[PDB]
Structure 1
Amino acid sequence: ADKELKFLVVDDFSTMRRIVRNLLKELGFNNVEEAEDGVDALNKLQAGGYGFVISDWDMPNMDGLELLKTIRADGAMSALPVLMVTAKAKKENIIAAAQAGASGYVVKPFTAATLEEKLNKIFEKLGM
């Protein structure tokens, strides 16, 4: 929490976005915006200031893999961390996300304790 980061939480289910935002609040991260799919996420990211993305995978309009690829291709935002979120209903194409440079993976639903452990692993390995 003594880390100043603006998060973007992306999920097409409003209920899950709110859960994740509230978990972040429990961890002391109070600057957290939501987006409902990858297209919406672009509009947020282009406004600037974001430091970490937590993105669902399967979404209407633009999915999380396409979002990840678009971020990684961007000359300013190419290193933005992206934690990919998958659901138990379907195992996603992890090989493609690994190829594209996902920062990590987590299966929803999860608690704040799990999220914290995941975030800290990413902070440590990327050096932020």
Structure 2
Amino acid sequence: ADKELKFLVVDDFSTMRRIVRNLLKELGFNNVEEAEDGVDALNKLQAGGYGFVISDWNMPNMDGLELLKTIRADGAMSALPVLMVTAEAKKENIIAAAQAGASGYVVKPFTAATLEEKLNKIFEKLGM
């Protein structure tokens, strides 16, 4: 885990993005950039330089699931870890996220610890 990993936190609720930015800062990750939906996120990712994407579920323009699919289908981005943030721990969501190729999922609201666990495991499965 390089503490300079460029995160992209996607969410249409600014306050949720602020919270996440803090949790990450608390865990030592200070390279955090935001996006307000899938389309915004995709446009920012085009510039490259990112190494992790935390993304909320439902958003206008392009929802999380679509952002995941699009990332998975894009050449340069396909191997980018995507942590899906859902509001409900319902199986249909959880399964769709797995089928789509998500690196994990976390239900909000979540603590710094929960976040850190999820992140540690994803880093583990990629030895990064």
User: TM-score, normalized by length of structure 2?
Assistant: 0.93
Cα 1:91–1:19 shift into 2, 3 Å:
farther
Task: Give ranges in structure 2 of 5+ residues lacking alignment.
Answer: none
User: Is the 8 Å Cα contact of residues 38 and 62 (structure 1) preserved in structure 2?
Assistant: yes
Task: Give ranges in structure 1 of 5+ residues lacking alignment.
Answer: none
Aligned-residue sequence identity (percent) comes to 98
Cα 1:40–1:25 shift into 2, 3 Å:
same
Cα 1:28–1:117 shift into 2, 3 Å:
same
The CA RMSD measured in Å over matched residues stands at: 1.6
How many residue pairs were aligned? 128
User: Is the 8 Å Cα contact of residues 5 and 29 (structure 1) preserved in structure 2?
Assistant: yes
1:99 aligns with 99
Cα 1:94–1:10 shift into 2, 3 Å:
same
User: Is the 8 Å Cα contact of residues 89 and 107 (structure 2) preserved in structure 1?
Assistant: no
CA shift for structure 1 position 98: 1.2
Cα 1:89–1:60 shift into 2, 3 Å:
farther
Q: Are 1:46 and 2:26 an aligned pair?
A: no
User: Is the 8 Å Cα contact of residues 86 and 92 (structure 1) preserved in structure 2?
Assistant: no
CA distance in 2 between partners of 1:72 and 1:24 (Å): 24
Deviates more, 1:6-15 or 1:84-93: 84-93
User: Is the 8 Å Cα contact of residues 4 and 30 (structure 2) preserved in structure 1?
Assistant: no
CA shift for structure 1 position 83: 0.3
